[PDB]
C-alpha cells in the first residue's frame, strides 16, 4: 500500500497567561509516533510508538531543537498576524501548520504538502508543484513575497522530496511489524426489533488497521446509501479503528440485505448476510 | 565515535586492500574521503542506509560496500601510486542531520618496491650545560633517522608515562637525500623541562617512535629483519651533572 | 563555487582576533558548521549554527546571516595552539540535505609572543655514543625564520613552538645536524 508521514502543529495564544500553547504530533499513516507539548514537564520531543525509541540522543536533541524553532516562529507569527488583521492583544488566536509526504507501494515519492492556517482559515499553502504559493488574501500575499525572497519553497521541496521520504522509509523498516501490518476488520451483524413490522440490521467492522474502510449495504444487489446510517470511523484506543453501518428493513426480509466491506487487509471484499 | 582500520598501510603497486570504517552512533549516512596537499577533502563515495551507494567527486579506482548500518568498506583492487593519500571516513545521522563525525584517518603509501621500506633509528641528545646555566631550563632532542615511508608517530615518555607538555615535533620530516625521489626521512623533536627536573636522577626520559611498515604477510628476502610495524626508542636518565 | 572561504594562509599575533569568513551560494541552506583540522589529524567539528544570530563558545564566536548568505568564525585572544586549518561546511540542499559541501579551508598560524627573547645556539651530546651531537637554535623571536641547509651534508629543521604550560613560557627552536661547528650552522 501507499504510506505517508505527516506533522501537525498548533499554537494558541493566551494573553496574560504566558507563552502560547504549542502542541506538535507526528504520524506514519494512522500511527502517532512523536509529540511535543509546551506545557509538559520534559520540554523534549517525546516518543509515542515503540519503534522510534531506538533513535539515540542525537535524534531526540535534533528533533527537540527543530520543534522549538517551529514554536518560536509561530510565536512571532501570532504577533505579526494580530497586527495584520487589527486584532487586540486581549484575544486568543491560533496558528496551525501541517506538512508531509506520501510514497507509493514501491516507496518512491508521490507528493508533498505544506499548508498554514490562521484562526482555522487557509492562509498560505504550497502548491503540488512544490514551487508555487497559494495566498488566501492580501496579508498572506505579503507573507508569500517574504517566502519567495527567502527561497522557502526550495527549502521545503528538498525536505519533502528528500528528507521526508528517507525518514518515512526508515520508520517503515524499523516499525515494520506494526506499520506494514494490515489488520483485517473483525466483522459481525446485530439485529434489533424496532417494532413488529421492522428491524435494524447493524454491520460492524472492528479492530482494523489502517483506518481507511468502506462499509455499504445492498438490497437484492442494489445500493442503499440514502437509507444507511453510518458512523464516522473512530479510534479504538489500541492502534485499531472501528466503524458501523445500519439499515432499517421490513421484518422477514432480512435475507435480501447484504453488507459489503472493503479493506486493505482483505484478500477479497466481504459479503455478510443476517444469520 | 568513528573508527578506521588500519591506521597505516604500505602496499606494493598492484596489491589490493579494504579499509574499514565503523561507527556505533546510530548513524545512517557514511562517507569515504581522500585528502592530498593542494586539493583538500575529496569525496570518493557515500552511502545512505536503505539506498544504493552514491559516487562522490573522485570514485574511479575505488569500490565500496555497505553490508550493515555500522560498517562502510572502501576497496582498492589494484593499488596505484596515485592512491597514496590519507583516507578519512565520516558519519552523519541521516538526511537533514548534516553534522559529520570523522574517523582518525588511514595513511596509505603505495610503492613500486617494498625493499626500500626502513624503520627509524632513534637517538636522544642530552641538554647543554650552557643552556641549563643560562636559562634554568633543559631541552632534550630526539632524532629519528633513516625511515621510509613517512609513517611515524613520535611521543615522549617520562618515568614510564607519556607526557603532553614541553614538546614540539617537526610538522614535516626532512629528506635525507633530497636529490633522490625515495629519500629516507629524518624527524626531530624537543622536550624542554626545568633544569631541576632534568637534574633529578630518579627521572627517566624516553623518546618513542612508533613506525608503521610492512605486514607479516609480505614476502621479505633481504638480510635485515623485515621492516614491520614496531616501536624504536632511545632514552636518558636525568642527573645532577 | 558553492562554498567560499578566506583564501589564506592567515597569520595572527598571539592575543589578537582571528577572523574567518565563509560565503555560500544557496539561499536555501539550513545547516552551517566550522571544522578545525590540526596538521596530520582529522577534521573536528567545533561550531554549528542554524539561524541568523551570533553564537558564542568560549573564545569562539560564530555568526550567521541567512539573508546575506555568509557565516563567520572569530577566535579571540588567539593562541599558538589554535594554529590549524579551519573549514566552513554547509549541508547541501540539492539532493535532499544528504551531504556537506566544504570550503577550501583557511590555514591559521598564530605566532607566539616571545616576551623575553634570549636567542642562542647550543650543542647537545648523544646519550649513548659520545661522538654524535646536534645543534639547537632556541629562544628566538617569532619574527625570525630559519634558512634551510645549503650543504647537502647539513640538515636544518623548520622552527617549532613548544609550550611549557606549567610556566606560562613558550619558546621557538630549530635543530641542525650533520656528518661541523654549532655556532656557525644556522647562517
Amino acid at each position: 500500500g501507499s504510506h505517508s508521514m505527516r506533522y501537525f502543529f498548533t499554537s494558541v495564544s493566551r494573553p496574560g497567561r504566558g507563552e502560547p500553547r504549542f502542541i506538535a504530533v507526528g504520524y506514519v499513516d494512522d500511527t502517532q509516533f512523536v509529540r511535543f507539548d509546551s506545557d509538559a514537564a520534559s520540554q523534549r520531543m517525546e516518543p509515542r510508538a515503540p519503534w522510534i525509541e531506538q533513535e539515540g540522543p542525537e535524534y531526540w536533541d535534533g528533533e527537540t531543537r527543530k520543534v522549538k524553532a517551529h514554536s518560536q516562529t509561530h510565536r512571532v507569527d501570532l504577533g505579526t498576524l494580530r497586527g495584520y488583521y487589527n486584532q487586540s492583544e486581549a484575544g486568543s488566536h491560533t496558528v496551525q501548520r501541517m506538512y508531509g509526504c506520501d510514497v507509493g507501494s514501491d516507496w518512491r515519492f508521490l507528493r508533498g504538502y505544506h499548508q498554514y492556517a490562521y484562526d482555522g482559515k487557509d492562509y498560505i499553502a504550497l502548491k503540488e508543484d512544490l514551487r508555487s504559493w497559494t495566498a488566501a488574501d492580501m496579508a498572506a500575499q505579503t507573507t508569500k513575497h517574504k517566502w519567495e525572497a527567502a527561497h522557502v519553497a526550495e527549502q521545503l521541496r528538498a525536505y519533502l522530496e528528500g528528507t521526508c521520504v528517507e525518514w518515512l522509509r526508515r520508520y517503515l523498516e524499523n516499525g515494520k511489524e506494526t506499520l506494514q501490518r494490515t489488520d483485517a476488520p473483525k466483522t459481525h451483524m446485530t439485529h434489533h426489533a424496532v417494532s413488529d413490522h421492522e428491524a435494524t440490521l447493524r454491520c460492524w467492522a472492528l479492530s482494523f488497521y489502517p483506518a481507511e474502510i468502506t462499509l455499504t449495504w445492498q438490497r437484492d444487489g442494489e445500493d442503499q446509501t440514502q437509507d444507511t446510517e453510518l458512523v464516522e470511523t473512530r479510534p479504538a484506543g489500541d492502534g485499531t479503528f472501528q466503524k458501523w453501518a445500519a439499515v432499517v428493513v421490513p421484518s422477514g426480509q432480512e435475507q435480501r440485505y447484504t453488507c459489503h466491506v472493503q479493506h486493505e487487509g482483505l484478500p477479497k471484499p466481504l459479503t455478510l448476510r443476517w444469520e | 565515535g568513528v573508527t578506521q582500520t588500519p591506521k597505516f598501510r604500505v602496499l606494493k603497486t598492484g596489491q589490493s586492500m579494504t579499509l574499514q570504517c565503523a561507527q556505533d552512533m546510530n548513524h545512517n549516512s557514511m562517507y569515504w574521503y581522500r585528502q592530498d596537499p593542494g586539493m583538500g577533502l575529496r569525496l570518493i563515495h557515500y552511502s545512505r542506509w536503505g539506498w544504493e551507494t552514491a559516487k562522490g567527486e573522485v570514485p574511479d579506482g575505488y569500490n565500496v560496500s555497505r553490508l550493515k548500518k555500522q560498517n562502510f568498506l572502501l576497496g582498492l583492487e589494484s593499488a596505484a601510486p596515485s592512491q597514496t593519500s590519507v583516507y578519512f571516513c565520516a558519519s552523519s545521522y541521516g538526511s537533514g542531520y548534516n553534522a559529520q563525525t570523522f574517523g582518525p584517518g588511514t595513511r596509505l603509501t603505495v610503492l613500486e618496491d617494498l625493499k626500500n621500506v626502513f624503520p627509524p633509528e632513534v637517538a636522544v641528545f642530552e641538554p647543554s650545560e650552557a643552556e641549563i646555566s643560562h636559562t634554568q631550563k633543559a631541552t632534550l632532542v630526539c632524532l629519528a633517522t633513516g625511515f621510509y615511508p613517512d609513517h611515524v608517530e613520535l611521543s615522549w615518555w617520562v618515568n614510564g608515562k607519556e607526557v603532553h607538555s614541553g614538546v614540539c615535533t617537526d610538522p614535516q620530516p626532512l629528506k635525507e637525500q633530497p636529490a633522490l625521489n625515495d629519500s629516507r626521512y629524518a624527524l626531530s623533536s624537543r622536550l624542554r623541562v626545568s633544569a631541576t627536573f632534568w637534574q633529578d636522577p630518579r627521572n627517566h626520559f624516553r623518546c618513542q617512535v612508533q613506525f608503521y611498515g610492512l605486514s607479516e604477510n609480505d614476502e621479505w628476502t633481504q638480510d635485515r629483519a623485515k621492516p614491520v610495524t614496531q616501536i624504536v626508542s632511545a632514552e636518558a636518565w636525568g642527573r645532577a651533572d | 563555487k558553492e562554498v567560499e572561504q578566506n583564501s589564506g594562509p592567515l597569520s595572527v599575533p598571539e592575543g589578537a582576533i582571528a577572523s574567518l569568513n565563509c560565503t555560500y551560494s544557496d539561499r536555501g541552506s539550513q545547516s552551517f558548521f566550522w571544522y578545525r583540522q590540526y596538521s596530520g589529524k582529522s577534521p573536528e567539528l567545533i561550531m554549528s549554527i542554524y539561524e541568523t544570530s551570533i553564537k558564542e563558545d568560549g573564545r569562539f564566536t560564530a555568526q550567521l546571516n541567512k539573508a546575506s548568505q555568509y557565516v563567520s568564525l572569530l577566535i579571540r585572544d588567539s593562541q599558538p595552539s589554535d594554529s590549524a586549518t579551519y573549514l566552513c561546511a554547509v549541508g547541501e540542499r540539492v539532493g535532499g540535505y544528504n551531504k556537506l559541501i566544504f570550503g577550501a579551508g583557511t590555514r591559521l598560524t598564530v605566532k607566539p609572543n616571545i616576551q623575553n627573547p634570549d636567542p642562542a645556539v647550543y650543542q647537545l651530546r648523544d646519550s649513548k655514543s659520545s661522538d654524535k651531537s646536534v645543534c639547537l637554535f632556541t629562544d628566538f623571536d617569532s619574527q625570525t625564520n630559519v634558512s634551510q641547509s645549503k650543504d647537502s651534508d647539513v640538515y636544518i629543521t623548520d622552527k617549532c613552538v613548544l609550550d611549557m604550560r606549567s610556566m606560562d613560557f613558550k619558546s621557538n627552536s630549530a635543530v641542525a645536524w650533520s656528518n661541523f661547528a654549532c655556532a656557525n650552522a644556522f647562517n
Binding site: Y7, G26, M45, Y59, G62, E63, K66, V67, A69, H70, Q72, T73, V76, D77, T80, L81, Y99, Y116, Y123, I124, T143, K146, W147, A150, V152, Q155, L156, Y159, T163, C164, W167 | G94, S95, G96, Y97 | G28, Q30, S31, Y50, E51, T52, K66, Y97
Partner: peptide, 11 residues
C-alpha cells in the same frame, strides 16, 4: 524527522 529552517519561515 522534522523540517529544518523554520527560523527562516516567519509570516
Amino acid at each position: 524527522s522534522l523540517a529544518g529552517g523554520l527560523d527562516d519561515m516567519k509570516a
